[model samples]
Every structure is written in structure tokens, then in C-alpha cells.
Target: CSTLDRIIGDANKVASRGGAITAKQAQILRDNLPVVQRRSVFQNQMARKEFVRDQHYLMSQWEANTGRTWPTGATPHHIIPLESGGANKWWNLMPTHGQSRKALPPGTITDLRL
Candidate 1:
């Protein structure tokens, strides 16, 4: 069953037992409801803006540190992998040549070849 249905069922079970759903329980149900399908980057203005801004900032930093600009067509890399619940925030992003660059919170690892 869907998440919402399961929550509702839980509430029904509580009600059947002479216990009303608590405010916290209600809030949990509301917060855990499934969101609509993921929207495209173009549809999320804030995310898109942050992405572009971070990309520019990362490349600029790279050039300053190494005295060489990033290769043409380099892509923004997530310092924290997206699968690990990383956001596209500035501090969580960097530029890379699309190699096996891996990063985790508290540290980063990369085989970045310039």
C-alpha cells in the first residue's frame, strides 16, 4: 500500500483501540507523504541558479589555484554524491572532468587530472 494509505491505516487502528491520533502522529503522516515526480532543473529556478553560480565559482577557483582554466566542456561534480542525499548547494559542488571523482561529508577524494 501507499505511504499515505499505511499511515491512515495506522490511525484507524489507533482509533479502533480508543486512542486518537496524536498531533505528532498526524504531522508525521503529513510530512512523509509522497511528493510529486521530480521536476526538471529548468522548472526549479532556485536550483538552476545555484547550479550555474556554483559552476562558475568552482571553475574560477580552479583557475586561480592551478593557474589553468578547466578544460572546455567540464561538468560540475557533486562533492557529496547525490545518492547520498547531497544537495546541489554551492559548498557541495565542484568542477571535474567527469572522472571517478568521489566525495563524502567531512572529506573528499579525487583523481582529478588536469
Candidate 2:
């Protein structure tokens, strides 16, 4: 498995110790819609790269605190479109990338001012 899988697997064990979480709880944790919808895709790829770097710093802190491993090359994710006033801060980032052409999902539909 990849580093992400290992980290998530470990976290799952911690969660399981408390008991199985309901689907709702699981949904809350894995909710992707907000993340996808809010990200600032309007920025140039270079700006996006800077976001990615910041996200890695956040991921490293998270890993150290939670005893998990973050995948290398965790891309930055915007929580709000920069066109819509999204700030390049800790709360507006995540790790996602197109590992392969076949894995590319449909692109987002929002328009940005950039």
C-alpha cells in the first residue's frame, strides 16, 4: 500500500478502538464535495505549486501529531476559489493529484475571476 493507505489504516485502528463510527461520521470525515467545490482553481499552476508546498508543511505537522505518514507530493487544495476570495492559508489546502491519466476525474464546473 502507499504511504497514505498506511497512515489512514493506522488512524482507522485508532477510530475502531472507540467503536465503529456510523456512516454519517464516516461521511463527515471523507466529505469531498466541499473540498472540491471550494478550491481555488483560478490561480496559475505556479501559484498552485506554492499552495502545494504549504500543504506539505501542514501534512507534516498532522503526521507528527497523529503518528501517520503523509504521502509525498500532496498537492494543495483550495477551500474557496481564489476568484471568490480564497486565502492561501492552512484551512484551505489538502493533498490531491492526478497520479495517472486514467485516474483523472471530471473537472470542476465553477468559474473563477482569474
Candidate 3:
């Protein structure tokens, strides 16, 4: 997964653990996040190269922190579209089924400005 996918995953866990959240409603404040949380997604770590199915690529931030054993068809997802300037950070990614990524189930649309 790309950087965005990892960020989304963290949000999902946080929202699931306590307050409810949706993709469209999820908001991330990079500067407001703690140093450890920010460092968790550094390129040397979360972005490590890994072989998915097709080819070798950076591991999702979520996978790096959560686990490497991905769920069947589970793929890294970007909460904030990278095209829109979402950094490859832990706060902009999430894990979702391949089908769900295409279908765009709830909680897939996080917004990050800056």
C-alpha cells in the first residue's frame, strides 16, 4: 500500500476503538500528532519494500505497525488521495478488501489538508 493507505488504517483503528468515524468525516492534523506517531510512518520503516502479488512495493503503514499477514484480498488504501497531496504518512492510509477499495465502502474517504 502507499502512504495514504497506512494513514487511513490508523484512523480506522482509532475510530473503531472508541468514537465512530467515517471516511468523509475523518480529519488528520499532521502537526498535532505525537512524534512517535509521526515517526511510525517514516520511509525507512513503513515504506519498506515488500512483495505483494504482482511485484515488490512499499508496505502499508498499517501493515508495518499492525501485521504483515494481510487478510485475503486485503489491500492498502489511501484515505486522502495522493494525487491531492496526501503524504505517505500513517495518518492517511487504511486497509480494505480489494473489492471494497473499488466499491468504496464507508470510511474510505479521509481528508487531509497540507
Q: Per-residue lDDT for 1-114 in model 2, tens only?
A: 533233334434433222222344233333432233333344545456665667657656545544445445544444343443344554333334426544223344433221
- Worst 10-residue stretch by lDDT in candidate 2? 16-25
How does model 2 fare in lDDT? 0.41
Over 4 Å off, model 3 = 1-29, 32-57, 99-114
C-alpha root-mean-square deviation, each candidate: 21.2, 10.9, 12.3
Candidate 1: regions farther than 4 A off: 1-49, 82-114
Collision pairs in model 2: 39-78
| Best first by TM-score, ranked | 3, 2, 1
Global Cα lDDT for candidate 1: 0.43
Deviation from truth (RMSD, Å), model 1: 21.2
Reference-based lDDT, each prediction: 0.43, 0.41, 0.40
- What local lDDT score does residue 79 receive in model 1, on the 0 to 100 scale? 38
Q: After aligning candidate 1 to the native by TM-score, how far in Å is the CA of 65 from where it should be?
A: 2.3
Model 1 vs. true fold: TM: 0.31
**Tens-digit per-residue lDDT, 12-85, candidate 3:** 66432222223333444244231222222333233333222312133444445444443455455545443333
